[PDB]
């Protein structure tokens, strides 16, 4: 409500909350059937077609007080299967245990495990594709008294094998 | 089995293997006769591989699924698409299975819900599902089912 349309709609704040297994972020990899991935450049191009194939890669640039450390778990759950709600659950699917203290930028390439040869860009049905999910593997550890709530940024893009077809559009007044 | 068009066509054979492509044209609109408003919504569509827990309450753990694939579809863009390859437990899907243990094959289950929270103006949405079997191969050819299903 308040953070949409303002510049805070990009700052993902790792809070000073407990080890609640409820993910710290779950993104539905269903391009048009999920409002978030439709405002990205990659999403904009996908509003000019009907089909899309290939992989999409996710990057996570951590912006936390150098000294600060911790381990997060970026996980992906293939199409159809319900979004992982508990750590352990997600921990069993495709996941990278990204180390805050070691490398700042985390990349996770989501593959092309699709039924047909071309998936939709319409909300006819909610054909739940992937699920980019980030969980608290450990927790954040901060030196001395440095702000206990720092932020992260997420970047999405296409891969060289990404393609589109059937030029359609929607422009209004 | 629910739709006729695709059914008869698939019945012309006894066995098949087919990489299955699904498309999700999602459309919405407001219910109540009111000048109520809403922000663009994001729907989560979940494909659940055959032989898993089927979600009930929109709530429950089975909606997080560390394994089940999902697709977050933001409204107002090109419809969503995922390809689930031959997910048969046998060497072919049995269109007409003879014998005993109807659960024909089980191609999975789809669950769709709104991700956004409770908006004052209630919004309905219909999720159309399309299925293009690709790389299809078939076996023994039966006579076509003539009648009504």
């Amino acid at each position, epitope marked *: 409500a308040t953070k949409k349309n303002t510049m805070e709609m990009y700052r993902v704040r790792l809070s000073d909350k407990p080890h609640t297994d409820d993910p710290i972020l779950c993104l*539905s990899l269903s391009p048009a059937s999920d409002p978030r991935l439709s405002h990205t450049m990659l999403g904009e191009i996908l509003n000019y077609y009907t089909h899309w194939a290939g992989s999409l890669k996710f990057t996570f640039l951590f912006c936390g007080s150098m000294m600060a450390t911790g381990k997060l778990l970026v996980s992906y759950a293939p199409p159809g299967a319900d979004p992982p709600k508990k750590r352990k659950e997600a921990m069993l699917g495709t996941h990278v245990i990204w180390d805050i203290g070691l490398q700042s930028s985390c990349t996770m390439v989501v593959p092309w495990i699709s039924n047909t040869t071309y998936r939709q860009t319409i909300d006819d049905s909610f054909t739940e594709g992937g699920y980019i999910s980030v969980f608290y593997q450990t927790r954040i550890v901060v030196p001395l008294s440095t702000p206990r709530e720092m932020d992260i940024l997420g970047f999405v893009s296409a891969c060289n094998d990404f393609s589109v077809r059937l030029l359609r559009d929607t422009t209004h007044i | 089995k629910d739709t006729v068009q695709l059914r008869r066509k698939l019945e012309f054979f006894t066995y098949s293997r087919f990489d299955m492509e699904l498309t999700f044209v999602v*459309t919405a609109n407001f219910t109540e006769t009111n000048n109520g408003h809403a922000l*663009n919504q*994001v729907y989560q569509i979940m494909y659940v591989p055959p032989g898993a827990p089927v979600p009930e309450k929109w709530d429950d753990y089975t*909606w997080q699924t560390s394994s089940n694939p999902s697709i977050f579809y933001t409204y107002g863009t090109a419809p969503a698409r995922i390809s689930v390859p031959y997910v048969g437990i046998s060497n072919a899907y049995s269109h007409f299975y003879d014998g005993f243990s109807a659960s024909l094959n089980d191609f999975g289950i789809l669950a769709v*819900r*709104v991700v956004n929270d409770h908006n004052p103006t209630k919004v309905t*949405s219909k999720i159309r599902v399309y299925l293009k079997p690709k790389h299809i191969r078939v076996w023994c050819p039966r006579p076509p089912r003539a009648v009504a299903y």
Partner: nanobody
């Protein structure tokens, strides 16, 4: 476009048991989990209650728990939060959102409500 209309928000007085309700447009309730977040006056947003009507998996906030009851309809596609025993801190502006989810977390949500304030002041 998915619509969630936040209704049932009005002034209660320390110990109130009011109820909120939100409809589901564009999608079937079970496709999205459903939740609530409150913007405490001059504070950041806090998760309150969230469940997915698919199989109904209840989850509440630490403060909120026990008192408030999150329930879901699949016929009218509505979420009913029975805000029982409302207290002075619970004087915040609520918002109904659909997640994935299946619970309380700033992000992990898609469509958001317009706005409604339940003032818990005698």
């Amino acid at each position: 476009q998915v619509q969630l209309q936040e209704s049932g928000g009005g002034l209660v007085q320390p110990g109130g048991s009011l109820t909120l309700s939100c409809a589901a447009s564009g999608y079937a309730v079970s496709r999205y989990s459903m939740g609530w977040f409150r913007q405490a006056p001059g504070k950041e947003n806090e998760g309150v209650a969230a469940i997915d009507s698919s199989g109904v998996g209840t989850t509440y906030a630490d403060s909120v728990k026990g008192r408030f009851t999150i329930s879901r309809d699949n016929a009218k596609d509505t979420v009913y939060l029975r805000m029982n025993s409302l207290k002075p801190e619970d004087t915040a502006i609520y918002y109904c959102a659909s997640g994935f989810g299946l619970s309380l977390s700033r992000y992990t949500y898609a469509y958001w409500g317009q706005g409604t304030q339940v003032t818990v002041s005698s």
